[PDB]
Symmetry: D3
Subunit: 208 residues, 6 copies
């Protein structure tokens, strides 16, 4: 299928974003050597994703989907990997310590944002089936329902996490407080980017 | 492939047109009972072609070719079968006797017009390969070369056949002379219709 | 609806073709003065159809159908009116007398060919409803069924009519025999042209 | 301009059809050797037109017009040349003598049908200007007006020519009478084919 | 009109964003209970907008506009409502007090950013008229002129507001200063998002 | 070429962004009067870019590229100029002093981000050549290679610059530290926006 190269790229981007959980777990236990190694794994997966992206961009004729849709889809997908690499780099660069009280909830929030990327990977895969009449509406309905569940959870977790940070601001350095808010925001951006992947698929299905 | 139903229809239309050779051979030996039976075979193949045409017209989503191109292709194909059925019916209806001197050349002309339909069937089949970058130009070049060979032969045979009829006009009834010219014309129309099949394929390849 | 100007043109083309029945009825009773007047009515309706055609060709923006489909549809429609005008002119020009024995069957054949034009008018009208998801397949299925009924009848009548002419050839002038076959053919062409109208509509429905 | 190869082909097709006037003038003066030579000129121009057709079919990227429109335009254009070659061949093959009384009017009818081809050549050329907003409607309006003038003339001439033939039928051989009607028809077909050229241009302008 | 569901969604998104003025007015008078209630109104309007969005995404055939354009338009529209809900939530979560000196100018800046959303609502509505030739250029010209007026005002107000904040930084907590800059930025984002709505409409008009 | 107005706009946007180097050089030497004048030059170039943008938006027929692609391209281009104007305004508004140690590296980072805009200008220009078959893949390959070189450099410089800022945070006011990070981010955004210009061109080339 013409979607297979895209599925492979999306699988790589999911792998890259998923490494953020053990990356952060390592920072939390104070094992910076390990966090540095997991960041190399994140960079490798990003580099690999890039190479797949390149080959796709440079490679047809009779087509069941638009070339431009595939390119736009690819663009959204690779942003997820770049976000993961960026976040990990900024964290290593400041040796960011998530405050004790925020550790458990931060990991749960991160994991749920990564689940949003997991949904994107899942929808791209489920699309082979749709490529192999009326079924498109049911597909989009399901996608919407699945995302609403994840968004409800991530919103609640994001709020709790910020509420906790707000209570700790008086005891932290302001610049560190701001970089903690930026990190929560950036993590949330992974889920935003994953939503744009499903939007691009929905546009393709709307073309007939 | 989306072209498979079209290939099947084209195979049926070729079978239907090919029956014109034994149909005419039977009329020439004066076995009208047999010619009547071969005309039922021609009608059956036309009916079968129609049923395939109907199912295609009534039956998608992600598509490597345009729906409208397939419909226009189908329309041109079914004209070939209708032409064969029409010719055979008119011949049975008048009990048309091809004059002795014209028999051999008429059959050779008919056969070569049917070969033009054979080329259409061949190009439709060779298209799977093209469906499985630059190859499209070579495909069209070949198609053009193959048709030029057949057209050169059919033109020469048509001329010789009319030259012979012209010499015999003084000995035949005028209405019969006119119906002999119409039959030569109609046979030639099979090759014209087959050319329109290859033209429709060429248009599809031009869309990218 | 964007189809309304097309429906109006089709209504005019149907009116023009329908005048062929009383036109021929007049020739059969030997009232050539009346046939000449009905031919002026046929020419008027053709002129009127032309003026509608012109205004459409010269006259948008947001469109529920393709401009080019409407133009191609219009082209097929106006051929029907031109055919009626041509047939009537040739008949007046030769003062064509349909032989006695062929009169009743010729009129029934003509009427049934005109019914094929009536089907085209009917399908164009029924299209407003379709313009006001899955319904398109049922529409085409119905159109196919309606045409198959008319084609079965016209084929049978055409055969009977030619069989009768064949029996009378020995008693007629050959040129007159040939012009009688041409007239049967031309009448049959009205139904062929009407079929091309429904084909163009089917192509439009295939675009989504 | 992408239209330049099409203009060149159309110029060749016009040249080919125009040779029919001196071809027929030669037959009328009984100089069959000359008519045979002018028929070789007609065949040469057709062969040349074919070679241009071939190169176009085999030869882009960023395009101001649709590739498929150019191919369909080309197809209509080359039919005109094939018609001229066919007519000239059939006339040489029967050594067709146009009756004395029909000679002058036949040539005037032929010339006016060729003028219809001249209009097609003219519209294709005037299209460069349109290729170099609202101007498209005025262009089509003019084309329609120019064609209406030619069609009015050709219709009148065709009628007069058939009226004259009708008066002479009693003195000619029936087969010859029929081949004279076929020749008038075929000549008229040149103007029909030229009209289809302008229709294809009108469709292109309707795409925006 | 196919635009009606979009107009309804845009009306809801405007209502949702407009509630930010009384929401902020309540925070400024220290009535947090009221601000909390107005935030529930903002959430309700967002939820309602979502439900309209969902029904549109799941619901044709003959279309005067592209399905994908409507989906992209809808996506931009719903971002405005999400922005309003997000801003109100963050403000309630920190119990953000806009400093006294900034209150009047902040409200005027907010109101003018909301006017930019009002322009989007207005252009979507004015589009029915355009849906019911040359008029599209005048429409876009007007839209551009209307936006230039609003952008000139919002830019000036944004600058004055930041200039005032800059003067007060020495007397505030740094984290609070940063969250005040973020709030000004976020408000400005409403006007940015509204501009993207008009851009999507302009793209639709460019398709013909 | 239809791309010429776009090339002119891109040239203006490049000029506008390039003025950021002498603008910042002036701030670094403490010549605020000069920085204010260079900011007027930046605003002028932005105003000029806007006027070109407007004329393009308001101004065809036969087109080698899609109107909507040109509009989307234009939108991405004008964001670069708006970013330059915004950055310069914020810097003048706070009288931002880049710390001594960061001056040299900041200018080198800025210059390299501007080189990314230079690449966009270069690719838009090189596109005339492509507008005057297989060449499109080589074009995109080159563009990718050129960008990878610039991105490698900008990433390294951005990291070094943040590492240096991190070391100086203890000696600066927190709000100033945050506005220094925002300025590095904004500068980096110029290169992000330039990448989106090349992406839009790549999409156009993918349409055939």
């Amino acid at each position: 299928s013409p979607i297979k190269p895209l599925q492979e790229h999306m699988d790589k981007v999911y792998d890259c974003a998923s490494l953020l959980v053990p990356f952060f777990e390592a920072t939390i236990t104070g094992n910076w050597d390990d966090a540095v190694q997991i960041r190399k794994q994140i960079s490798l997966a990003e580099k690999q994703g890039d190479s797949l992206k390149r080959e796709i961009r440079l490679t047809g004729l009779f087509m069941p989907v638009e070339r431009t849709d595939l390119l736009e889809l690819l663009t959204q997908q690779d942003k997820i990997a770049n976000k993961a690499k960026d976040i990990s780099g900024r964290v290593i660069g400041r040796q960011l310590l998530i405050p004790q009280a925020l550790q458990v909830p931060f990991i749960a929030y991160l994991q749920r944002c990564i689940d949003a990327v997991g949904l994107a990977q899942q929808v791209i895969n489920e699309l082979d089936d749709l490529l192999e009449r009326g079924r498109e509406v049911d597909f989009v309905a399901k996608m919407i329902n699945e995302l609403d569940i994840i968004e409800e959870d991530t919103d609640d977790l994001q709020i709790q996490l910020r509420r906790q940070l707000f209570a700790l601001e008086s005891e932290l350095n302001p610049v560190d407080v701001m970089f903690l808010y930026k990190t929560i925001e950036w993590v949330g951006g992974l889920a935003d980017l994953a939503e744009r992947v499903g939007s691009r698929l929905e546009l393709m299905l709307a073309r007939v």
